[PDB]
Amino acid sequence: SHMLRPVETPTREIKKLDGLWAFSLDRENCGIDQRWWESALQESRAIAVPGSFNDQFADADIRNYAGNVWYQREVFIPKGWAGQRIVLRFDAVTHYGKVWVNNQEVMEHQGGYTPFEADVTPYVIAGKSVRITVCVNNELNWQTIPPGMVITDENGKKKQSYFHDFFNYAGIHRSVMLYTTPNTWVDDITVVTHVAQDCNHASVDWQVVANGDVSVELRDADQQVVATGQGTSGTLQVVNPHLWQPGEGYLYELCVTAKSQTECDIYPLRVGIRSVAVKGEQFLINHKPFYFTGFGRHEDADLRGKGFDNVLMVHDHALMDWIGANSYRTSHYPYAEEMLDWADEHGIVVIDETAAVGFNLSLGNKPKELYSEEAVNGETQQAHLQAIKELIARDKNHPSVVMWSIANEPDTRPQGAREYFAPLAEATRKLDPTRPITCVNVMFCDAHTDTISDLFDVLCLNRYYGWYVQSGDLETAEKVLEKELLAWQEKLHQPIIITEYGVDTLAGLHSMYTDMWSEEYQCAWLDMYHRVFDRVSAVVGEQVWNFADFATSQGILRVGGNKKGIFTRDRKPKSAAFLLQKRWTGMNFGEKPQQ
Amino acid sequence: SHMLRPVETPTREIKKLDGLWAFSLDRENCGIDQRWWESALQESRAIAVPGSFNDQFADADIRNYAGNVWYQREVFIPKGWAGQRIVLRFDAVTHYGKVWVNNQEVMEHQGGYTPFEADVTPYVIAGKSVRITVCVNNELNWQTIPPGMVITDENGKKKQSYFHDFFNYAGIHRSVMLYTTPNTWVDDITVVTHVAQDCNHASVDWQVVANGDVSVELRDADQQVVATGQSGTLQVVNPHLWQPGEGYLYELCVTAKSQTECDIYPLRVGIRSVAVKGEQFLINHKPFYFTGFGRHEDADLRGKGFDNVLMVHDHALMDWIGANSYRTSHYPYAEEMLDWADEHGIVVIDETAAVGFNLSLGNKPKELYSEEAVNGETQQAHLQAIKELIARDKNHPSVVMWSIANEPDTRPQGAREYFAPLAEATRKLDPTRPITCVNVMFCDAHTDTISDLFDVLCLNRYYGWYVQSGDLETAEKVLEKELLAWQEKLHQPIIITEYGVDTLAGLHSMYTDMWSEEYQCAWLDMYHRVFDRVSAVVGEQVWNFADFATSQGILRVGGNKKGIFTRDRKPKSAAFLLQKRWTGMNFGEKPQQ
Ligand SMILES: O=C(O)[C@H]1CN[C@H](O)[C@@H](O)[C@H]1O
Ligand SMILES: O=C(O)[C@H]1CN[C@H](O)[C@@H](O)[C@H]1O
């Protein structure tokens, strides 16, 4: 389904619906029955949008709730939008949302992390107030991405189980907006940027969907039109192009114009002229080997759960720049698109990942066979392929995105894993031939055990030697780590990114014994992993788990959450922060370090 | 001087300008000479609006920067706005803003904490993109509210010094926005809300400033019209009284009719009255007992920046702990907080940025009230600060009292003659609510001169902390003795507007000694036992709701640690001690004995 990022243009207006909404639980599950969307939510309180609903109220009972919740506000449609295509859009509703404009149901979506939107024109009058009601469901089952099991106790009270290591935050996490186009409008663009080997010339393929004649012009940073073309498709030539390079991010603008006899639409699409290719064991960007540094992240912070926030984005990017990070992965769900707009503009390299985590009952009563009709089945695979389609639909034109991760840490031991994953790998490549693909690999599915990694282009490993196994023993951990990395190099001859390596670290726990949970062990352990990486030629990246401490469901393994942060959840540095800064700022930009 | 909260109506639209702006420092103070507003800011970076610029970048050199900073962004004016009045409004810029539209200067403001707007219709074209540049200055001198002193070191690099115990956060802390009116518009409203002793009747006065034919209607909560007029009084049988802890709201719709154009503006109204009666604070002719906090506009990363989730959460916590009230220590808060307190029936002491009129808290002018310090030109700004606050909040039923200064020194030469003209000029700017002045720790019953000019006595006390340190026994006697001495002197209502001790979350002690969680509990306990045994005390506002940032010093362990909650909003044991007292008692009534 076509999904361009709304942008204000001579032909296009946006009105944000972010702010205080009315909010109500639905403990009874009668809000659909009683059509709660007809009148004011009856027992309601104020809530911030965007935000997770769970932590806004300092209330355990709302935090831990499973079921439906209701959001509602009134909004004036701009007078002067009369005779315009009016769209209502939600950047994200976690995990499921149904929307009513007054009494007309207009939208339904499953998938907590990518946008959905409807033509609401026939259900609103320009200059009049409208009521927008949302039913938001946070329940996971074997056909949701990610999967889960609702457990219903003898009293019929629901309790979400899930297999991923981060809290099941829900609500309207990202901006809600009414926006306009002319009734003739550009509905979809696809740009591919080819780059010659000598880097001295580049072609830009375009493809456009719009109910009118299409023209495009390519403008550089100085606004100088550098190329033009006509019709739904073609190829712009660019001599001596300003390449989009990691650390710089030079953007052109592709102005696409949809022109009927009466009216016209204008969409500016930012373009980074760059190519991305695996070549043996090297990850090439503009024909030059790249070395990833930086983090697995999460969309997580105090009070707002996974809600988008501009101060948080500005602050975290200052921290990643300070520390010398050149890259990250959207672990483990599509991130707010303003993150990909920031990366495009600042030349930050991103591994874009789906919400497909938790396909693994072995990370600790769960179904006996992971790949079966009672768990991951043909429906689950369909839901997964849909998850992949929406992510690529959103993110295909972000030059910051260099690789698709279609899943995180699935159990690949069973016969079934390869039957499930092979067609998803093939479909992903069809949806976007321009980027390499990966499936992030769990520690127990080692080089000798794993049955799917040959189907993907880049080997993305999550390794905790010296933490979950060889606990506290850097000596034995180093031998085991180096042995396995070389066994993967021999097995597949792919580029290897260590997408996770980290240890829980209590900020302020200090030890002369350099033992587990201390700041000092975090430092020694990352240091050991770095020496190993620098001795294996197939290793082309290191992404520390995690940028910051983050919330998980409660358990004996999590001291108030996951403490593998380099920074605390309030973004204060642990000692290891200064260790990463030395290594990452001390290396040459984008180049594998040396002994 | 006319300040109406922009709200959307059939005749009034709004576009928020909040989001990422371009941002630059101006170390070389050459921005105005090079007229930076004429081009895109050079060597800029993204900043979030709203929020302080100081903590967004984890960079000490920006955090501590003194001088001018530049914000810039482009924005499309909506096509349907052609032939309407286009305003540009900043809800707050700390401490000074000057604003250009393309190449045209449109406004200036001094005052970190209140709105300012210009009609920009002539310099914008609906359906075109225009560039908004803002030069924001964070410097404080003896004429700014609040005061400080700038030192230019050996290289022209400024270094700011100030006399208040909260960090000097600056930037565009609140919403920026374009909004429309018809060329005929409502431009101002005042509303007074008399309530007969019986309570079973009430009358609402209304004045309006509009360049067209004024008509008003007052609807109740269910949108049933309940009065009408064409200046005037509306009458109301068995009125729904705005009551603490409920906050019933009516809507005064105010129409401004030309033959050509019409303008509607709804204004929420709470039918309540507030007066002192001897030793009692009275709302709707009932004795009230204030509980809750001195607060701050302070949080991780965003500084004093307004945030929706933070507002929703902090209110959630106050609710849970049983707070009915707070003070806007020590500056006007974001209007949203008062729109909130209006709806939920929270009581608010609304306070000016006038704090640190003092040189003895914890090189500088040897005479506080002099030409080289707090002079007549200072008294003026202070009056201008009092004007702008009442111009914005005169209509909020939550605002139960004005606070015209916090912790002014009262010993130096000619305190009274400085303040007498301000307490007068306050009651003339609005006589509907009592006024107060917050009374610093060392300015005791004998020392203070000024208390007599004000309706309610607001004490900040710290016995057992800054004095009689860690001795709760000696601290109790000295506190009781002093609150009785204050009864005898003024027979006014006594609110403790600050009582708090620095408490390091996780510091546990068997010896119940200073900085421990246990000390915070045993000490608030003692202030509590005294409060109850003194008929004159009609309020207790704990200092502070949460840990907040200060300037660096030997007295501040990473900031002020007097919070009941940490900066990340986690409770200390004292959160549970206050929750028993404040919810175990009766809404708005002093406890027994
Ligand atoms: O902390 C950990 O152990 C890691 C393990 N690997 C998963 O991909 C992460 O979600 C996180 O749970
Ligand atoms: O923490 C303190 O000591 C208090 C004393 N009184 C002031 O009004 C507050 O701003 C704060 O400095």
Residue numbers in the entry:
A (entry chain AAA): -1 to 362, 369 to 599
B (entry chain BBB): -1 to 228, 231 to 362, 369 to 599
What does the paper say about this structure?
However, we were surprised to find that although each of the structures contains a ligand present with full occupancy in the active site, none of the observed ligands are siastatin B. Instead, siastatin B breakdown products are present in all structures. Three of the four enzymes (AcGH79, BpHEP, and EcGusB) contained “galacturonic-noeuromycin” bound in the −1 position of the active site, as opposed to siastatin B. The smaller functional group at the 2-position is both well accommodated within the active sites of these enzymes and the correct functional group (OH instead of NH-acetyl). The 2-hydroxyl is within hydrogen bonding distance of the catalytic nucleophile and an active site asparagine in all three of these structures, thereby mimicking the interactions seen for natural substrates28 and other inhibitors. The 4-hydroxyl of 4 has galacto-stereochemistry in contrast to the gluco-configuration of the natural enzyme substrate; however, this position also appears to have productive binding to the active site. The 4-hydroxyl of 4 forms hydrogen bond interactions with the enzyme active site, for both AcGH79 and EcGusB, see Figure 2AC. We however show here that three of the four enzymes that were soaked with siastatin B have a galacturonic acid-configured noeuromycin bound in their active site.
